[PDB]
Amino acid sequence: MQIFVKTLTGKTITLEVEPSDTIENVKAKIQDKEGIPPDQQRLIFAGKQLEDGRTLSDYNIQKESTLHLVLRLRGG
């Protein structure tokens, strides 16, 4: 399924993922497509920061869900 990942500086990168995929694997795909290292990735879905160990299904992330990417560099 397709999901969307928007960053602060625009950049809306589409990912082809499975509901059972891990946050680690998603970050890895982002690193494969964009060049942003996983350790510098903070993902937010539905107002909650995603953590290692979960699946996309653990956050009820469905088809064409929109995630938001923020580097740990730019604080919040």
Side-chain angles (χ1 to χ4, degrees), residues 47-62:
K48 229 294 184 301
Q49 177 188 279
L50 314 183
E51 298 286 352
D52 289 330
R54 326 293 173 280
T55 62
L56 295 172
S57 63
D58 288 338
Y59 292 101
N60 196 15
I61 295 179
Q62 305 292 341

Side-chain angles (χ1 to χ4, degrees), residues 7-35:
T7 76
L8 290 173
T9 54
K11 320 299 198 317
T12 305
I13 156 185
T14 68
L15 295 180
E16 279 58 43
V17 295
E18 298 306 318
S20 54
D21 293 343
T22 65
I23 299 302
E24 306 84 288
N25 174 260
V26 170
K27 291 165 133 193
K29 290 184 178 179
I30 299 185
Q31 191 196 25
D32 297 328
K33 185 151 150 50
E34 191 124 54

